[PDB]
Structure 1
């Protein structure tokens, strides 16, 4: 694609979501992280919801 792009692009989709989301979720502990996870659950992005559910459930648990 140029060099190495397709299987580094797959990681980029796993990683760029966190590099924004955890950077919005800095510092918040207990239920305050859960109120950030409310604002991120109400996100407009539908694929990023399911793609980050692995971590979003380990906030809720």
Structure 2
């Protein structure tokens, strides 16, 4: 958008920036729904929005879930085949006792 300013006008900007007013409206409302959640409880609050109903969102959030749920499936594949859980911060839902 800056390279063309040297032509575009206001009524021309509206169509250019009509789509990134939505992605910047799901993400700017995805970080408020999960404010105090840490660990797996956050990977469970970015899954509650996956079913947005529209395919323009149900296909955006269902990608952030595929990144947020990678560390969770890292403990799981560790606590299942090796039985050695290690998380200084309490995230995994299996809590040991010293």
TM-score normalised by structure 2 residue count: 0.49
* Gap change, CA 1:55 and 1:46, over 3 Å in 2: same
1:34 to 2:40 alignment: no
Which of these two proteins has the greater Rg computed from alpha carbons? 2
Q: CA RMSD in A?
A: 2.1
Size of the aligned set, in residue pairs, is 60
Deviation of 1:19 (Å): 1.0
Unaligned runs of 5+ in 2: 1-9, 70-98
* Gap change, CA 1:4 and 1:43, over 3 Å in 2: closer
Which structure has more helix as a fraction of its residues?
1
Q: Which has the higher contact order (CA 8 A, sep 6+)?
A: 1
